[PDB]
């Protein structure tokens, strides 16, 4: 078998894009329930209809019989975030919410009854809009008392529920999405390169302390990064475009060097030089950081990226999708390799999937389904890459695949753009029955699962 | 400045290269006293008139005049191999020979009258004759033993002289050259990539092995890895191409990967299953390799190499790479490739890095300036080496941690590949040519002078 038998198959999801409920059972308003246009919209004053993250696709309610469509496919994991509003509403309550507690030893216990291991995403893009509003968000250090108090609790709470936990999705999109990932409340072109590398450090730092407390709770724990897979290539074999691709690549790697290694890579002291950039450090920090590092390493992976010296180049060998993304399955093979080859530490693959527009439709069974065929090929493709990968010896610790029920997007709030194997009926403009269909990804998917993937050739 | 104080600026050559005196004072044969064609050439009998190796330079005798010369350029590290044959004239002796021992140890001595610390390649394609017709050289377990006796005792004798160890000069180096650097006595034909692969196991046990040793005898002592730099770009942005250009990468990180992390690396099983080779390991061997490790890298750097997923379809090249120009003598020129690679190493490894070859090929000729000096006007070396180490400034500033760099061939030698002198590296012209004619007589060429404002200024003449 080309997939180690404890390979983990399954979905991702995080939990503001299908949850919904956010007003109830105590939980105050995070920044997404401000974020009616999504991270790349503007933010409203106070939340509004328009929102469809206040609905979502109704998983709060529903994920009992979602679930029943995982068991379906075989998910042997499931990767969700757990909300810190419904945690911590405000942020600053010196005691947790207890219903929002007991939704998630809900949510864990039926994953566990249908052979469901949990994969944790402490904080993913939903920090509570007190904590925005009033601190700024990451930009100010006081945000790693809040979120240690917040880990503190699930960690100890979920200590014997949850294995696999990961700190932060991709600390570094506080770069493009200040307001949305680091919490950031502050204009966009206010911000200095300094103020947005502090947030990224006071991120890692909270990361590693996090840590350390996740071990003293339970030393079977597993804590994971997530970063953002993007393998780059030069245009041409020209040394300056190769070099320019080789500098192209050290913005990301700087991150997981830090998550990984311990410390700032040796290359970014000249980087931070010519940016203007000097991190302050609290004493504890340096000892902080390089003593908890990450036992391994998450990301999502789209697409790679062709660079140049030329005073963002369209790759002539890859093809396109419906939505007029550049598709490159090598680059899988390619990336997982490279991380594998700086790092020496497990991979796990959290986010990957082809959006598109699906329309639900009768099939000749007279079944109303998606007929997303693209989806599977896309699928199968970059799944064959990851063999790849693991026959080049690349530890893989598993595959979830993003939104495998349909949800809410991150860019732009909308529904419309569709990556799951489970159709939701909900429309961009709110109205729909919320009925859940088998896409025929999903029969296909599962067929890969119960194969343990043997099914692909 | 941007060089740090204590850089280590020099030149390198090969015992063999260079030496002479072929059987003087105890001295057995080497596998090189029998290559007169070189390393891409055919093993004679016995020693013959036209291999150039047997007088050398003559190094032996003028090795102070020489390093006087040395000195003049300021030179602070001086990196030359211990010939194994003048220690073990067969290999095999219960005892060493006590000419050899006393020879390096007066070469050390100069070196360090001047203020130049040695830089010692422990084997540099030096193997006795006598251990390489016997067993056949690595592919026989037993040069382990027959390396370390002979490494202990250079290791012990020169513990206050030498500070800087090379356990050898590209261990892979035996895929190609089985006879020259593996010292390996079967012919072509009969060489299987299994055997290869196990002569190259025994050659890394081995560096484990004497890096643990040294670690015992002295505690100052750095130990390092010598490799072949060779950085590969993809044709195109095509990601076939660029996961073929990682392939082959891999072929030479397998063995910077076993010395510095201390065991095969994951794609190793691949290859190797896909390859038919399945390498013998001795019970100790896996903890040995694990335990000790190198302290640091070194490498020589020459050229980059441009690959493709479907080469055929350039009709040339392999692989030329359009932006690159070419020495007079044919080989690319890529400076920024030392950068590239400096920083794909760091990157990798995180520990200090050697550069102990790079240099210019050239045939030179030798006239009278219109001082009525005798020299060499190269311009084109001068500014080889100057464009080469504003990029090792280049990754200087990268963060890259760089102990030194030494100049190949200071002093024109013998080709390792040809056994040749016309192809000259040198910043000193030796006159000797492929006949054997000349004085013998040394001149500083024109880029002395310039290596030497450059050493004296620690890199800020760059500037």
Same mark, same amino acid.
């Given at each position: 078998?080309?997939?180690?038998?404890?390979?983990?198959?399954?979905?991702?999801?995080?939990?503001?894009?299908?949850?919904?409920?956010?007003? *109830?059972?105590?939980?105050?308003?995070?920044?997404?329930?401000?974020?009616?246009?999504?991270?790349?919209?503007?933010?409203?004053?106070?939340?509004?209809?328009?929102?469809?993250?206040?609905?979502?696709?109704? #998983?709060?309610?529903?994920? +009992?019989?979602?679930?029943?469509?995982?068991?379906?496919?075989? #998910?042997?994991?499931?990767?969700?975030?757990?909300?810190?509003?419904?945690? %911590?509403?405000?942020?600053? *309550?010196?005691?947790?919410?207890?219903?929002?507690?007991?939704?998630?030893?809900?949510?864990?216990?039926?994953?566990?009854?249908?052979?469901?291991?949990?994969?944790?995403?402490?904080?993913?893009?939903?920090?509570?809009?007190?904590?925005?509003?009033?601190?700024?968000?990451?930009?100010?250090?006081?945000?790693?008392?809040?979120?240690?108090?917040?880990?503190?609790?699930?960690?100890?709470?979920?200590?014997?529920?949850?294995?696999?936990?990961?700190? %932060?999705?991709?600390?570094?999109?506080?770069?493009?999405?200040? %307001?949305?990932?680091?919490?950031?409340?502050?204009?966009?072109?206010?911000?200095?390169?300094?103020?947005?590398?502090?947030?990224?450090?006071?991120?890692?730092?909270?990361?590693?302390?996090?840590? +350390?407390?996740?071990?003293?709770?339970?030393?079977? #724990?597993?804590?994971?990064?997530?970063?953002?897979?993007?393998?780059?290539?030069?245009?041409?074999?020209?040394?300056?475009?190769?070099?320019?691709?080789?500098?192209?690549?050290?913005?990301?790697?700087?991150?997981?060097?830090?998550?990984?290694?311990?410390?700032?890579?040796?290359?970014? +002291?000249?980087?931070?030089?010519?940016?203007?950039?000097?991190?302050?450090?609290?004493?504890?920090?340096?000892?902080?950081?390089?003593?908890?590092?990450?036992?391994?390493?998450?990301?999502?992976?789209?697409?790679?990226?062709?660079?140049?010296?030329?005073?963002?180049?369209?790759?002539?060998?890859?093809?396109?999708?419906?939505?007029?993304?550049?598709?490159?399955?090598?680059?899988?093979?390619?990336?997982?390799?490279?991380?594998?080859?700086?790092?020496?530490?497990?991979?796990?693959?959290?986010?990957?999937?082809?959006?598109?527009?699906?329309?639900?439709?009768?099939?000749?069974?007279?079944?109303?389904?998606?007929?997303?065929?693209?989806?599977?090929?896309?699928? +199968?493709?970059?799944?064959?890459?990851?063999?790849?990968?693991?026959?080049?010896?690349?530890?893989?610790?598993?595959?979830?695949?993003?939104?495998?029920?349909?949800?809410?997007?991150?860019?732009?709030?909308?529904?419309?753009?569709?990556?799951?194997?489970?159709?939701?009926?909900?429309?961009?403009?709110?109205?729909?029955?919320?009925?859940?269909?088998?896409?025929?990804?999903?029969?296909?998917?599962?067929?890969?699962?119960?194969?343990?993937?043997?099914?692909?050739?």
């Amino acid at each position: 078998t080309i997939f180690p038998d404890d390979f983990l198959w399954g979905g991702a999801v995080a939990a503001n894009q299908v949850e919904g409920a956010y007003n *109830e059972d105590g939980k105050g308003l995070s920044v997404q329930d401000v974020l009616p246009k999504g991270g790349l919209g503007e933010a409203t004053e106070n939340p509004t209809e328009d929102n469809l993250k206040l609905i979502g696709i109704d #998983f709060y309610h529903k994920y +009992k019989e979602d679930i029943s469509l995982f068991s379906e496919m075989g #998910f042997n994991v499931f990767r969700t975030s757990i909300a810190w509003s419904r945690i %911590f509403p405000k942020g600053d *309550e010196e005691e947790p919410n207890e219903a929002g507690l007991k939704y998630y030893d809900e949510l864990f216990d039926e994953l566990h009854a249908h052979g469901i291991e949990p994969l944790v995403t402490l904080s993913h893009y939903e920090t509570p809009l007190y904590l925005a509003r009033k601190y700024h968000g990451w930009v100010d250090r006081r945000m790693i008392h809040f979120y240690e108090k917040f880990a503190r609790t699930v960690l100890e709470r979920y200590k014997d529920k949850v294995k696999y936990w990961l700190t %932060f999705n991709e600390v570094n999109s506080v770069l493009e999405l200040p %307001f949305t990932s680091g919490g950031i409340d502050i204009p966009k072109e206010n911000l200095s390169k300094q103020e947005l590398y502090q947030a990224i450090h006071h991120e890692l730092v909270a990361s590693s302390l996090v840590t +350390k407390i996740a071990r003293e709770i339970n030393s079977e #724990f597993k804590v994971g990064c997530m970063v953002l897979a993007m393998p780059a290539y030069p245009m041409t074999p020209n040394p300056k475009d190769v070099w320019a691709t080789h500098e192209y690549e050290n913005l990301n790697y700087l991150f997981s060097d830090v998550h990984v290694r311990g410390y700032y890579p040796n290359y970014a +002291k000249r980087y931070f030089k010519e940016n203007d950039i000097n991190i302050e450090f609290a004493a504890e920090d340096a000892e902080l950081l390089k003593n908890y590092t990450v036992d391994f390493l998450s990301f999502s992976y789209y697409m790679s990226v062709t660079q140049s010296a030329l005073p963002g180049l369209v790759n002539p060998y890859l093809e396109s999708s419906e939505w007029g993304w550049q598709i490159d399955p090598i680059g899988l093979r390619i990336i997982l390799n490279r991380y594998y080859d700086r790092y020496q530490i497990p991979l796990f693959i959290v986010e990957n999937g082809l959006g598109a527009k699906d329309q639900l439709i009768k099939d000749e069974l007279n079944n109303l389904t998606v007929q997303d065929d693209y989806r599977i090929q896309y699928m +199968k493709e970059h799944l064959l890459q990851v063999a790849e990968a693991l026959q080049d010896g690349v530890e893989i610790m598993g595959y979830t695949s993003w939104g495998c029920i349909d949800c809410v997007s991150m860019s732009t709030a909308q529904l419309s753009k569709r990556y799951g194997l489970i159709y939701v009926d909900r429309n961009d403009d709110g109205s729909g029955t919320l009925n859940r269909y088998k896409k025929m990804s999903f029969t296909w998917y599962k067929e890969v699962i119960e194969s343990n993937g043997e099914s692909l050739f």
